[PDB]
Design a protein around this ligand. Sequence first.
Ligand SMILES: [Mn+2]
Ligand SMILES: [Mn+2]
Ligand SMILES: [Mn+2]
Ligand SMILES: [Mn+2]
Ligand SMILES: [Mn+2]
Ligand SMILES: [Zn+2]
Ligand SMILES: [Zn+2]
Ligand SMILES: [Zn+2]
Lengths: 514, 513, 510
Amino acid sequence: KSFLWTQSLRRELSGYCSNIKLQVVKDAQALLHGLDFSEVSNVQRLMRKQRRDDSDLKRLRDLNQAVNNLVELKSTQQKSVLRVGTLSSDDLLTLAADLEKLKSKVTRTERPLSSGVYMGNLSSQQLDQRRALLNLIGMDGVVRVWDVKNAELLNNQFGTMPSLTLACLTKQGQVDLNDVVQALTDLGLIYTAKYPNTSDLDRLTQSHPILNMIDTKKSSLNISGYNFSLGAAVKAGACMLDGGNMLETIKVSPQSMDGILKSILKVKRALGMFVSDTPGERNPYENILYKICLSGDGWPYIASRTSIVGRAWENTVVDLGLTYSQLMTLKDAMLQLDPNAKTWMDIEGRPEDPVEVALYQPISGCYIHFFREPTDLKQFKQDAKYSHGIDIADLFAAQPGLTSAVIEALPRNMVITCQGSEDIKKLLESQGRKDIKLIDIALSKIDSRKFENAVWDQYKDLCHMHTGVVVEKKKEEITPHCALMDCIMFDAAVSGGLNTLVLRAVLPRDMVFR
Amino acid sequence: KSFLWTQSLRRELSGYCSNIKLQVVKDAQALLHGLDFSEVSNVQRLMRKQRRDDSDLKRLRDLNQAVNNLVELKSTQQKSVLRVGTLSSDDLLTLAADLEKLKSKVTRTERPLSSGVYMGNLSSQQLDQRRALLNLIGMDGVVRVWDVKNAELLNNQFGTMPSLTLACLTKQGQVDLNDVVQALTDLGLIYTAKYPNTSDLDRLTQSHPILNMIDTKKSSLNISGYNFSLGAAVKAGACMLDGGNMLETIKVSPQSMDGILKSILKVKRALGMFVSDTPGERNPYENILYKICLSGDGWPYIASRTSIVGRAWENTVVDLGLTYSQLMTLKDAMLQLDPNAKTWMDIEGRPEDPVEVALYQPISGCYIHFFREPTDLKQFKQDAKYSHGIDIADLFAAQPGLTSAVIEALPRNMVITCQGSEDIKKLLESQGRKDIKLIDIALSKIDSRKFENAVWDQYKDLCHMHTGVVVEKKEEITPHCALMDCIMFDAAVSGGLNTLVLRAVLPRDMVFR
Amino acid sequence: KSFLWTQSLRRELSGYCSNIKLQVVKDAQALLHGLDFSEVSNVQRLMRKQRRDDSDLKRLRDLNQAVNNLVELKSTQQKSVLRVGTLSSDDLLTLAADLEKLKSKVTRTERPLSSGVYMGNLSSQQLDQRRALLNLIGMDGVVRVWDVKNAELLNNQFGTMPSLTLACLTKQGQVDLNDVVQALTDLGLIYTAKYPNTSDLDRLTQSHPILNMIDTKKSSLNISGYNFSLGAAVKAGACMLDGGNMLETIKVSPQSMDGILKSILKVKRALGMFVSDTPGERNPYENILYKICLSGDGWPYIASRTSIVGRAWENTVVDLGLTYSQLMTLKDAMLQLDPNAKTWMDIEGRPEDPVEVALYQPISGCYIHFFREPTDLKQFKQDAKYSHGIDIADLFAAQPGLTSAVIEALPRNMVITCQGSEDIKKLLESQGRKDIKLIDIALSKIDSRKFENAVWDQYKDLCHMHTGVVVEKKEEITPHCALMDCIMFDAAVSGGLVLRAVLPRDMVFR
Ligand SMILES: [Mn+2]
Ligand SMILES: [Mn+2]
Ligand SMILES: [Mn+2]
Ligand SMILES: [Mn+2]
Ligand SMILES: [Mn+2]
Ligand SMILES: [Zn+2]
Ligand SMILES: [Zn+2]
Ligand SMILES: [Zn+2]
């Protein structure tokens, strides 16, 4: 059923496939020669930890950039732009659709590994429902695997490579290289007829003892390229064979990129392939579509991709409220909120025409931040003059529907704290949520903006929306008001000071803009 | 199309599958210590030949017997009589049907290797139609691969056996046994997912270089268990798994045989499996059905069956004109004859009611010999006492429609010599054949039976139908046989009886029901 | 590669061409004066209908008569019998094999419009494999364009003639006659160099605004000559130039038909031309060989072939087991059947040697009916006396092989109703199609023949195969027809009592 998709894709794309054994074995032997395999063991030890940080990530990345200096099979950073040539106008619509579906699927699978999910003080059903997602995606009260300052540094660091695999099995398994090649050759042949299972690897193990090391019924989620998964072994086995149509052996180029995708959409239409609305393991169509859109120059499956920054939906653009798919990602990202924690909220613009919305939980250092186009532009210029200093031409790019979707998804029975309950009340009540209880702090003007300078020095990087000169009639310039910076400084006003805390965004950055 | 047929039978016969990996390696280890592999070489040399004689079969049977004596995994002579129990009445009706069609297909595929096909003086169409039968089945004027005294001695001698295969690759291929067990396992694993082919064997040889011994582009037809076919290698691989629903491991017993046949039928029913009415390689259903019905006790696929007598349709029977598939076997049987050669004919019983019919070709030595149930009980009795001495009770088990079908399939424009034409004329006539010219030679009473005693002395065993005491106007005389008349009327002409072993055109099973 | 074939044919057939720039306009003028273009717009309306019947075909055929009555460039009824002479015995065999291929292509493209294809309860893949087919040829469940009682009235009615195109562009486009000639000539000068496309005519229209009535897509299939296709304008623009060896201008005669055929087969041989076995539009080779073999008198491209009767393999014959080509015709003929509906089956003779075979679906009203040669005569000559009464000389001409070819082409899972089973079971099992379930209705022999004399009164003309006198053990009785048995047994279950052949009319007898 998932091997059927794979089979049809082999035939259709067989003309882009080739023998690569010599290039692979060369990289394996070069790793066997150059690489510090005790550091391979060190990175594996770090992947056994349930909780990992920046020191673990640096070690992984350093080992990644050590492998990358020794292999000749690498993918280069290449942007890709697609138009009506070769691909039909109908084909680019489908791609755009499937890519934004993929976007949702991959963000809901991988992001909670870094962003985290709240597993503390919740109802019995909610925990059961959160546990089911975290069982599925491979995963105080906030549980996460990667506690990092920059989660973008987790991109493309976890892919599996045939040559690295072949080298790792040879050194760590303590047998000759050829034995390993002749082992994955027999595995590679199982794969020409079925996706290999537990019993398959068992009986080969009797003739090739190496295949013990490999873990068969482990997931491909929350693993590195240094681990001995079923997928890494199967992939490495596909490249040792003498031909022919093995999908792993695809190379992409600017000259070949469109045709592969055109051929992918032909199979998809013939068999009814689709991007899953579920988080978890990638299906055959999800896997190929991501690996090709990741780079316009390289080998989608088997190359070195650790040099590549960004995602597949970013590295490839289509030139032509919230989607059900976006709604899902948003609803999963918000499970990061502790509903029992103290929560600030602030807005810029009048409550019935908001242009900036923020929420802030000071103890976890997690925040919601987003934007909206105004309706009353004639009133927007007034607030640009005297309050927020936002230019509307920079709000054009704000993703629509975000205002209602966040206020709808807010934890029920949460208590929101605000400097002036007035407008916040008329906002939540309007967006359908009267239930949310509100505190009024009621500070004075001098005491609310006491830590205004302190907050902008530490956190300026988190909002770039405020450009316009703001005045205060007596005219003289003042600091423009950010909705986010307001929240932080109002918490500091009450606290009596401001700590150094690395803030974590609840929303993905891909969601704020279009 | 047919790997599913296997995959489905695998799923339903699971409980009959088993672990024999050890017992095969044990039987190979015994062959490695006991078998003369130089004699294996000698038999393989005989299989490379086009024409094979009685001495080649003697060597082949002697070696098979030596293999047989050493292996612990053998099949036993166990006959099966099927009764309504585990199998429903319809299940049994389906079994009987298929065994008739299977009988036809396997006779048409195997028997011409011995019986032969005339390939001399014919129309271009007749030769192309015939040479296209030879490539379907993997095969003076007569073409044959086996020229033997008795073609029952060919039966069950050619099967493949994993332990023999295992033993032969080890000793002839000059590698250790352990590395042979390694190689076959990986092939056996592939066999779970697909039937391995050209490249599948090519790429496997790259780690295990014992596998270029095995021939890929060679069929299963016209080869012995000593040859390294893909099927023998694939078969042996199946045994290399401690588990897996492989049909090759199955054990049959008087207790389990019905239930096995029941399970096969469900798979056949479900998918729509069938016996193909075209000669050639066996389909998975034809294969399983044959091997199971040969012996009620033993291992259908993997045992030594070299000591088993009878074809599977004789060893297993159901208890509760010709069939379409009997006809195609009959038409295929007739191709042995030289249509241009000298050909005799003779009948016993009235031309309107023949009880015995025989045709004889004196040069190739081949004959048609069959019987028929009469209708004129009155005329029969006086003929019996004056001519053939055939007991009417011995004729009820004769195949009906055999007169029609044989006379039809006789080649157009043949020349028949006969003693007395009036009779032969009326029988060929009322059947569509006026095209055949008849030569009546003028042999008087005395001369036509000069070598009568000589013919019966030499050929008695060919006819057992004449038991009654025949008399002339009184004293006893020798009963008239259609076939013995044909031979002796030829003897009169030639001035001497020939000294040869005769070959039958008709499959022996086909004469009686 | 198809304009190559055009070009190459043009040079080799240069001397059977003339000019015709006078008579084309002459007949176009004789149309301007004496033809109502309201009925022409009425025809365009009818061809715009998604379903069409006998009354719409009447309005077409009468207009194909009225145009034929005025014009002096016409083809007339002329049969051709190809003998050796100019065409070597090797040319004849290549011409007989190609016309046979051509039969299979033209039938699979044009016939489904009338006969219909079932697009109801089927597997997605079937709905894929069958819609693919429709978009190639330009097309309850059964979808059809022409629903007519006589489908032979459809033949030679959709033809395209330049003069008819000329007179149509003039009156309907409201420009002067000359401006139509000026516009199409300029398109004809493009036809000497390449086959005009989307942009060719788009730029022509910039000087010739009258050329906007014309489509690039689509097509050249379920259109009539009253439409404005690309080809109609192209053919017209060819007959506007002086000389140049223009294919469209070819006139055939009983003295010249062999040499023109002799010419074609050289170019085919020299290039690699052949009759496509895939349905759709004609390649230039299919089109030339078809237009010529239609008639041996007139202008195969530009004449008034609207009163010509019978197809090109019928109107032209050669004088010296089914063919690969006919089996694909048969498989696309069995697509008409609704496999999810009440279906009968009946045969004559014994199951191991059937001489007449029938299947019938009442609700739609379609049937399968064919004959076979017997093998056993002793049994056939008795069945003739006491069951069917068919003469053996009538059974030689029946197409051999249809019996197994139809049975295998049956839909999988279909359920048959019969009277009785057993011998229907014996037949579908010899062929090895057990998957088919059988219902015996098992009526009494008197109850089976209640509506006997009624069915032979409404459907007699559908079978002319029963000649001999069938007797009962004696008195004369009405012979048994396998097809007439299908309809009467249906009536005995219905209590009461059109028909469309599933099998091609041309495939029953060879
Ligand atoms: Mn990175
Ligand atoms: Mn504010
Ligand atoms: Mn191995
Ligand atoms: Mn005699
Ligand atoms: Mn009937
Ligand atoms: Zn801001
Ligand atoms: Zn005898
Ligand atoms: Zn009839």
